[PDB]
Structure 1
């Protein structure tokens, strides 16, 4: 097999590399790598190395990496550019793996672990590590085993061994329900003392050294705790055995308001799963406890126990250990679904970076561009210091707030990357500038044509047309990968809808789910077989189709995020290729493209309808337009359609056969006007929306910019079994909105769009009457909580104290003195409830850590004093009033002359 790296580090003058050799074995080597850097040289000097602008360079080979670093410093002292890859390990990988890396995940040791630490006096601080580690569960992907290290004797209690037999039993048998599929994979090791436990764990780690190390909060808790505890008991040298090269560093992570410490383990790649999830999931959750995320992702129930976690080991050691094991498994289950480790490996090996560097789009693109340029013996520029400067972004149209009955939307494919490719925007393709007219003049095609030679953006920049820049070349490669995965995602989505339709008529039989590839549209033969399947088999197939869609979504949306990240990196001062001329060339071209095509679409539809000056485009944001289709439907007449699907078909065909060719002609003209390199503005129909045929539903409404709701029948070629609400920006979509209120507001919207005013009034009346019975957690608001200290004046709110922070201060006074009460953590999320006048907490609200029940001490008083009237007005009535006023509807029935009968 072809060799591939696992990890790489620089330690002084050596590169330490772990890798898989040509025979598939894991090896380690230390290499005295001699790096090269570059200086500009005279034109009359033979070289094969050129910078990105075509100026000749001489290569300087150093005796060691320290010599190279010192040379960079002296070049700064002189005032001359020091060119080349200054991150020597990236250069090492580029020289050692000079081909497209083909990796074999089965050879990569991925470890998932979790620790338990009993603590009487609050949260066990990892930097102190003053309490025994009393359990470790460590799953190894190569062994496919859960290694369980269990402390039986502690200063906080002596316990009996954990029983695998009880662990396996149902909770209704008094068991812990450890999933049967992992029971045979557990290797249980009990210990008489903590010193022996940790010594054995280190010997185990030496034998089975993680390449990828993951788990939940491992970077901020488990790793520093284990390192510091071993340090405290045995000394520094022993703790450093967690690194295969015996090297560690305390790293200070700084933010806006403070800092924290993590431990860097040289020769390991730590990918904390909470951080993978936050980067790659595109969710914003009210809590990031593993129980909360597990319930959201997997629909598994919360891990139930009695009393505080600090007393769990002593009271129920059996459950304590089972729950440690289950926590490790839940992370593996989330990854089986979301496939974030797979994604990280794919992108890391593609770029040729340390795998943990996938968190940084700047580092990722630096490496991709470096490797690409090196292939042509070109030499990268030195990174420079720049002051942070604001720059302009997208255009968003101000919509007229209203109901909109029939709507079709259109959207540009991969806009910012397509602009980069069309215009040919790159550091080395800058050709010069032209004299800019107001943007309006380009939009309306009255400005002078910018150039007869170069490719232009309306910010004034011109670009070469003779050859593609490196940024367009490399962005195209990742875009093509994205396109492939998006295809699989959409096919799985369409396949899912076929199964949903079939589920209306399930067959009374015993059979099996079909063995199919859900990434490809079902054949006619498969469709025929599906129509004969049982509900059991169909539901299994739906679950599998949906898992295939999730896998495709992970792969496509994150490749989209990477290519959009390159457009953004051009506007980040830490990027080697930072240039506001290029960042603004992208965003300004986008503003023009949207407004240009709004004009062309209005012109086309006014012509087909025989009117003048009427606005068909009701809204647009960045690269999308929303078109009123009422007049199109009315030209046919509603009574002429057989059912909803009939007019949906008609609009689908109108969009494809009439509107898209008109849009294409419009953009081709724009490409010629700007003299661009290649026409790549591809705007296809996205949504077809409207009320059910014959209903009193309103179809859709807008309240303002980035705030609308549509009843959608077809999305990007997926024809839904049931209409789907597309809601953007409204409170239903915000993590700050109470869970039960999101649900109620969504039902109000559904009723408005699908059924009409009377239906809305009926539901509102019921919600208002019953909502006080809702569980307190479900009606609590949520907020991140920063700067608690800034606003705390002797335990009371200082000037301008935010509402949620006020709630935290209230909580802190109520729990004062208690060492075991859950503390609110700076920067994390809290639940918030309003309090009625004259409550014993002495303020108008209270807040506590999100994802948790409020502590028993004050729970009774919180429930008794919760202000339901304020809660309802603020979270439900006010947003609903906004929706209904915009849609010209009433949520309460107004008096009529009929009330007289």
Structure 2
């Protein structure tokens, strides 16, 4: 196979690189790199810069020589062209051509750690002890488990595999058997031996990419702080193959935590990878909920705080962590995220960790393309931070819109990038600036005829294609090609399964198999001339090829989606404030333009005037509300929801292409570009169920609403699915039972009608009173109690939770219960005025129950009324007031005339 690397780093005047040799074995080499820099030249040279000026190369003998040359030509006020970074230059020059790789060869390690502690174990200080370490090695495909037997928290027994494999009722933990087939378990009596064994295990099998769920937040820091605090820095630095473990301190978002960097292994936090490369939103991003979402496999419920688990049934503890690491692997097996990171790294010819930063990725790819085109990139200009106006958010009228067709165009910012061709050399000057409303209404004349136009007052070329548009075109063509390859792989795989269940009894031999291309019929016959084992190998190969196609396709997708955020950042090598402002305000101008055109055309077609049809909207989405066409055609014509959906789909199909084309060709000739790529679709629809009196879709606030979608992007649903955001259905401040109740109420108001919501209100209101008092008690933190107490009675400015704690202490005076301690958590149950305890609330310690003697007296005297309203009534009020709806009725309007 081709020579492909694992990880490159810089050590002094040398480039060190861990790679895979020609025979599939891991090796390490050290090369004294000779950087080749560039500078401006008056003489004729074949190397021409971005603008077109001739430039001359220059070789250098040392790393420091090149750096000092850059500094010295910087301080004399002269510009030096090329790349300041050198690892990218080395990797680009060494390989040059596109590289191939085998995912099996690269060692992908997974880690997870469990630390028993009195208080939350703090990764930065790492004061507690490690007793659970599960390291998953890929090529060895092994779950190495390190357990600490004799800790300072009391010695415990030894883990048993067969016991854990059993069902939980006999005392097991239900770990799947194939997992225990690979669990290499080792106990340790003392911490030093276990940590040293982990160190030497890292040494023997050095990971190439070292991941885990929330790893740089809790795992990496804790392990390294503990090895520093136990063994010393001289062993802490043994993690890296080059002996360099430098600690970065910032995490400037709140300045809370610290990240780590082991020079030689590419740390890649799986939590960040999921957060950035999933396009999904969840109420909580903790491993358990997302694992349930992804693999539909939670773990057996447990009891008590985690801190005491090690001392109660440590067995389960260790088994718990063993399913912890697998869950992550499961997610990988569903998403192929590490295959994606390998694909991007080897497509951009760049180090692995750069995947975290879109700017580095884009710089690498654009430099590689330009170097392939014999050009030179400019020096990274230094600019100050000048924030530009944000997103043009439409104004939503809090009104219920029954028939609302929503749509947003594809790659808004990337498409605009070809509308204005904004590369640094493409600027051509400025023109006379009109008010923005003039361009919105089109009253301004043509800014320029032979030169392109942008609403930011600036002007760009038309015949000279920019380098950034060239990269956009290349990546977009690659994405289209790989989507075609996906279709090819899909029907090839279905042909293979057709061959499989047709039947094939013959010889066994693997033929000349191809990838990412369509399979011929004669090839299908040849595969039918092979055994069912060979057929299984063939479907495995087809599935692997399809997964690689997915990695490539979503690679292109995220590159395109990240270019916009790359261009607007200061440190990007081709930042232009004019370009960023043009991009943003052109997006605003385009969405306003299409909103106005929608209003005009819908008024003309309906025959009315001055009517507004556009609802709320973002910088790319315009949820126009169109119900006039439905009533205009005649609601009686439709007998089923499917017929109405199909009719409005045909209306959208006949309305989008011609209207959008005419509403964008004039803007295209205004802007004077080569061609208008800018276009929307009919992605989303919504409609209240036929024959019902539900509102269908309302609008509570900006980006806070609900709809009953029938068809997302031609994915029809037999029953309508509710799409909800903004409200507390997804907000975890309220309990989960009320979350279910709110989502059900939302469904009822959208679809069923008024009386349904009234009945559900009354039903839940009856059902809430007898619900268990544990879940309907508010979680609060009990602190600084002694300050707010007055001889065991409430004092000045006594907090509500502290008030409840004081009432509890008064009530449990003489009950023989443990007192509430400062810093503890308490569930609070408010009380009505006049209780024998003489106060409006009570609070009891976390994880415990109310005392039996006073439990009945409390329960008979609790005030659930104001809690119910705060946890359930609040939302309905907003939607019903914003949907022309009532949430409880006490007037007739019927009994009289």
TM-score range, shorter chain: 0.7 to 0.9
Alignment match of 2:177 (pick from 167, 180, 194): 180
- CA shift at 1:480, angstroms? 4.8
Alignment match of 2:161 (pick from 144, 161, 164): 164
Alignment match of 2:135 (pick from 135, 138, 145): 138
**2:115 corresponding residue in structure 1:** 117
Contact 1:214–1:273, Cα closer than 8 Å, also in 2: yes
**1:200 corresponding residue in structure 2:** 197
Deviates more, 1:321-330 or 1:338-347: 338-347
**1-structure distance, mates of 2:474, 2:819:** 56
Alignment match of 1:381 (pick from 361, 378, 382): 378
- CA shift at 1:146, angstroms? 0.9
- CA shift at 1:127, angstroms? 5.1
Equivalences for 1:444-463 in 2 at 5 Å? 444-463=441-460
Pair 1:406 & 2:403 matched: yes
Pair 1:684 & 2:681 matched: yes
Secondary structure of the residue aligned to 1:175 is coil
Equivalences for 1:367-446 in 2 at 5 Å? 367-446=364-443
**2-structure distance, mates of 1:346, 1:679:** 31
- CA shift at 1:427, angstroms? 2.0
Alignment match of 1:225 (pick from 210, 222, 225): 222
**2:511 corresponding residue in structure 1:** none
Quick one: structure 1 residues 775 and 34, their matched pair in 2 at CA, closer, same or farther if it must change by over 3 Å? farther
Secondary structure of the residue aligned to 1:591 is helix
**1:709 corresponding residue in structure 2:** 706
**2:14 corresponding residue in structure 1:** 14
- CA shift at 1:795, angstroms? 8.5
1:305-329 superposed Cα distances (whole Å, 9 cap, x missing partner):
4554444334433222212212111
**2:756 corresponding residue in structure 1:** 759
**1:505 corresponding residue in structure 2:** none
- CA shift at 1:582, angstroms? 0.8
Quick one: structure 1 residues 231 and 889, their matched pair in 2 at CA, closer, same or farther if it must change by over 3 Å? closer
**1:54 corresponding residue in structure 2:** 52
**1:893 corresponding residue in structure 2:** 889
**1:508 corresponding residue in structure 2:** none
- CA shift at 1:302, angstroms? 4.3
- CA shift at 1:51, angstroms? 2.5
Quick one: structure 1 residues 821 and 333, their matched pair in 2 at CA, closer, same or farther if it must change by over 3 Å? farther
1:544-580 superposed Cα distances (whole Å, 9 cap, x missing partner):
xxx9999999987775554333222322222222222
**2:627 corresponding residue in structure 1:** 630
Instruction: Give 1 or 2 for the bigger CA radius of gyration.
Output: 2
Secondary structure of the residue aligned to 2:133 is strand
**2-structure distance, mates of 1:214, 1:48:** 45
Quick one: structure 1 residues 883 and 216, their matched pair in 2 at CA, closer, same or farther if it must change by over 3 Å? same
Contact 2:831–2:839, Cα closer than 8 Å, also in 1: no
**1:96 corresponding residue in structure 2:** 94
Equivalences for 1:82-93 in 2 at 5 Å? 82-93=80-91
**2:572 corresponding residue in structure 1:** 575
Pair 1:67 & 2:65 matched: yes
Deviates more, 1:163-172 or 1:99-108: 99-108
**1:594 corresponding residue in structure 2:** 591
Contact 2:779–2:828, Cα closer than 8 Å, also in 1: no
Pair 1:258 & 2:252 matched: no
Contact 1:490–1:549, Cα closer than 8 Å, also in 2: no
Deviates more, 1:735-744 or 1:681-690: 735-744
**1:357 corresponding residue in structure 2:** 354
Contact 2:251–2:259, Cα closer than 8 Å, also in 1: no
Secondary structure of the residue aligned to 1:281 is coil
- CA shift at 1:132, angstroms? 4.5
Secondary structure of the residue aligned to 1:628 is coil
Secondary structure of the residue aligned to 2:617 is strand
Contact 1:291–1:303, Cα closer than 8 Å, also in 2: no
**2-structure distance, mates of 1:781, 1:563:** 45
- CA shift at 1:663, angstroms? 1.4
Quick one: structure 1 residues 552 and 601, their matched pair in 2 at CA, closer, same or farther if it must change by over 3 Å? farther
Quick one: structure 1 residues 627 and 286, their matched pair in 2 at CA, closer, same or farther if it must change by over 3 Å? closer
Contact 1:423–1:678, Cα closer than 8 Å, also in 2: no
**2:537 corresponding residue in structure 1:** none
**2-structure distance, mates of 1:632, 1:481:** 40
Contact 2:804–2:841, Cα closer than 8 Å, also in 1: no
- CA shift at 1:835, angstroms? 5.7
**1:5 corresponding residue in structure 2:** 5
- CA shift at 1:208, angstroms? 1.4
**1-structure distance, mates of 2:83, 2:417:** 24
Secondary structure of the residue aligned to 2:89 is helix
**2-structure distance, mates of 1:153, 1:856:** 30
**1:496 corresponding residue in structure 2:** none
Alignment match of 1:662 (pick from 656, 659, 664): 659
Contact 1:253–1:262, Cα closer than 8 Å, also in 2: yes
- CA shift at 1:645, angstroms? 1.1
Pair 1:613 & 2:626 matched: no
Quick one: structure 1 residues 69 and 782, their matched pair in 2 at CA, closer, same or farther if it must change by over 3 Å? farther
Give unpaired runs (5+ residues) of structure 2: 491-500, 504-515, 518-543, 789-798, 809-817
Contact 1:807–1:832, Cα closer than 8 Å, also in 2: no
User: What is the RMSD of the two structures over their aligned residues, measured on CA atoms?
Assistant: 4.3
**2:868 corresponding residue in structure 1:** 872
Deviates more, 1:595-604 or 1:294-303: 294-303
How many residue pairs get aligned? The number is: 824
- CA shift at 1:610, angstroms? 2.6
Quick one: structure 1 residues 210 and 823, their matched pair in 2 at CA, closer, same or farther if it must change by over 3 Å? farther
Deviates more, 1:424-433 or 1:623-632: 623-632
Alignment match of 1:214 (pick from 211, 216, 237): 211
1:6-61 superposed Cα distances (whole Å, 9 cap, x missing partner):
111112222111112333222111111122222222x2x13232332222222232
- CA shift at 1:456, angstroms? 1.7
**2-structure distance, mates of 1:184, 1:668:** 64
**1-structure distance, mates of 2:786, 2:677:** 61
Deviates more, 1:227-236 or 1:426-435: 227-236
Secondary structure of the residue aligned to 2:877 is helix
Quick one: structure 1 residues 115 and 405, their matched pair in 2 at CA, closer, same or farther if it must change by over 3 Å? closer
**1:694 corresponding residue in structure 2:** 691
Secondary structure of the residue aligned to 2:18 is strand
- CA shift at 1:418, angstroms? 0.7
Quick one: structure 1 residues 872 and 96, their matched pair in 2 at CA, closer, same or farther if it must change by over 3 Å? farther
Quick one: structure 1 residues 894 and 316, their matched pair in 2 at CA, closer, same or farther if it must change by over 3 Å? closer
**1-structure distance, mates of 2:826, 2:368:** 48
Contact 1:456–1:674, Cα closer than 8 Å, also in 2: yes
**2-structure distance, mates of 1:428, 1:812:** 69
Secondary structure of the residue aligned to 2:104 is helix
- CA shift at 1:665, angstroms? 1.8
Deviates more, 1:4-13 or 1:889-898: 889-898
**2:79 corresponding residue in structure 1:** 81
Alignment match of 1:882 (pick from 871, 878, 883): 878
**1-structure distance, mates of 2:466, 2:692:** 54
Contact 1:489–1:552, Cα closer than 8 Å, also in 2: yes
Contact 2:343–2:555, Cα closer than 8 Å, also in 1: no
**2-structure distance, mates of 1:189, 1:458:** 67
Contact 2:6–2:20, Cα closer than 8 Å, also in 1: yes
**2-structure distance, mates of 1:833, 1:469:** 64
Secondary structure of the residue aligned to 1:27 is strand
1:94-129 superposed Cα distances (whole Å, 9 cap, x missing partner):
11231233222111111112233344x434445555
**1:24 corresponding residue in structure 2:** 24
Quick one: structure 1 residues 476 and 873, their matched pair in 2 at CA, closer, same or farther if it must change by over 3 Å? farther
Contact 1:286–1:736, Cα closer than 8 Å, also in 2: no
**1:529 corresponding residue in structure 2:** none
Alignment match of 1:747 (pick from 741, 744, 747): 744
**2-structure distance, mates of 1:351, 1:792:** 56
